[PDB]
């Protein structure tokens, strides 16, 4: 039941990558900002906003797995689910299973 989700996700990722070229082109402008961007000194006050925001909201696995970190995390969560669901994580459940 848990493996069905991973199977579907990995199939979707395989199909997504099959049609995707290798290597991506990155372009940029002349960047004339100079002094309008240096912001030299100690620092700006924008540092507070970076800490204020949070990035704990990531879900829906849209278009499959897009980062290798999520690829590893999905399988780690799957293994943790297998251990927790089985009667081996608590002490009461493990003791009763061992006796049985």
């Amino acid at each position: 039941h848990n493996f069905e989700e991973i199977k579907n996700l990995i199939h979707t990722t395989a199909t997504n990558l099959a049609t995707s070229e290798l290597g991506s082109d990155i372009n940029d402008e002349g960047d004339n900002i100079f002094n309008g961007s240096l912001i030299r000194g100690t620092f700006n006050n924008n540092s507070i906003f970076d800490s204020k925001v949070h990035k704990h909201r990531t879900t829906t696995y849209v278009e499959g797995i897009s980062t290798v970190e999520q690829l590893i995390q999905k399988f780690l969560d799957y293994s943790s689910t297998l251990l927790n669901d089985s009667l081996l994580t608590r002490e009461e459940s493990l003791r009763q299973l061992r006796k049985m």
Binding site: E29, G30, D31, N32, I33, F34, N35, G36, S37, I39, G41, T42, N44, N45, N46, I48, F49, D50, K52, V53, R57, T59, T60
Partner: protein, 243 residues
Amino acid sequence: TAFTEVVKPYYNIVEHWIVKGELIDNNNEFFIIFDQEQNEFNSIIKLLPKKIPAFIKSSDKIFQIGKTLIFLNKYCRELKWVNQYNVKYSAILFNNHQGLASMTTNEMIKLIDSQYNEILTFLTQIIQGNNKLFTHVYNFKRFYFMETNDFIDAIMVKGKDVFNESSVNISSTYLRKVLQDAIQISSVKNFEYVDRLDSRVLNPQHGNLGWESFTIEYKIDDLPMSYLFEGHQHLQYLKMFHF
């Protein structure tokens, strides 16, 4: 002669605030400031009407341009368009002209007006575009203001035994089972954003039963819109739902 070079740094502060949307002056010498102690976007930044200089124009538009820039490049994380905008308007401030100081008041006002229109156009195209503000407000009214009575009837019929016991006895798994069963029974299972729905118990007191604590919560945290809606509004959305 001295006032030109003395005022150039002030115009550099204004340039950084207008173009990229950042505050440079560490000392109190500008009519825009921050509040680190505040815990909501709309009130971290405040204006100082007493410190507005006489030689500056369209100050109340400068403030909005800077605030919307901060919002775009730090909450919505739309760095691509912010960079494109930065290049476009740096090519006018520093290439067409030689800075804000080397600009007549008429052209400076016109430039600020153009920036204001462009920025609010893009802010609309995001917030009421990709975010779909109206649709989520409609869903707020649909769920918090009881409109989809079938879903709530399904919750009450399915949870008629779970809610009987005290609020401390109800656990997370029973709530999840109740919510999923009610979603399947009712017509919300075909709803577009059925995933966002989530139930909770607010105050698990011994003297409070399940009926007096259950509250349905519509999750919009995944969107930048959640930062606009301060907690006070959500609390008033949970009070009216309770009644």
